[PDB]
Amino acid sequence: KQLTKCALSHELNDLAGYRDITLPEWLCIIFHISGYDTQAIVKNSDHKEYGLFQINDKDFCESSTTVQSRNICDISCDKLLDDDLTDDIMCVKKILDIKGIDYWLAHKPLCSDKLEQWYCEAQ
Ligand SMILES: [Ca+2]
């Protein structure tokens, strides 16, 4: 599902604020890593990243592959590809507690300035 900044801002209402990561920061990060596509999959060196939040199958979700996952979120990766972000957010929170926003930023400067540009209208 290709989401919009506005529908996504509504669906992320329970994520915004967790570990002090704001809503506009999340909209910025997600646009950059998945283009708001719940079905995004990016293949990396020794793993794949799934869904809107690009959760990897090395440590976080178990993919329907031959990859041995630590599966911290205790979730199959296919559940991170549908239009229900409920479980995705559950996992995102686990990652925030473990790795922090650093999991997404990866020491890069993206989404650091003019974040107010990312609001839907109000929030
Ligand atoms: Ca889901």
Curated annotation (Swiss-Prot):
Biological process per Gene Ontology, one example term: defense response to Gram-positive bacterium
Checking InterPro entries in the record gives: Glyco_hydro_22, Glyco_hydro_22_CS, Lactalbumin, Lysozyme-like_dom_sf
C-type lysozyme domain ranges (all copies): 1-123
Give the domain of life.
Eukaryota
Kindly list the positions annotated as binding Ca(2+): 79, 82, 84, 87-88
One Gene Ontology term, aspect cellular component: extracellular region
Q: Which PROSITE patterns match?
A: GLYCOSYL_HYDROL_F22_1 (PS00128), GLYCOSYL_HYDROL_F22_2 (PS51348)
> What are the UniProt keywords, alphabetically?
Calcium, Disulfide bond, Lactose biosynthesis, Metal-binding, Milk protein, Secreted, Signal
One term of GO molecular function: calcium ion binding
Q: Which SMART domains match?
A: LYZ1 (SM00263)
Name the Gene3D superfamilies for this protein: 1.10.530.10
Compartment list: Secreted
User: What is the annotated tissue distribution of the protein whose record heads this document?
Assistant: Mammary gland specific. Secreted in milk.
Does the entry annotate any disulfide bonds, and if so which pairs?
Answer: 6-120, 28-111, 61-77, 73-91
On assembly, the entry states: Lactose synthase (LS) is a heterodimer of a catalytic component, beta1,4-galactosyltransferase (beta4Gal-T1) and a regulatory component, alpha-lactalbumin (LA).
* Task performed by this protein: Regulatory subunit of lactose synthase, changes the substrate specificity of galactosyltransferase in the mammary gland making glucose a good acceptor substrate for this enzyme. This enables LS to synthesize lactose, the major carbohydrate component of milk. In other tissues, galactosyltransferase transfers galactose onto the N-acetylglucosamine of the oligosaccharide chains in glycoproteins.
Q: Which family does it belong to?
A: Belongs to the glycosyl hydrolase 22 family.
- Name of the molecule in the record: Alpha-lactalbumin
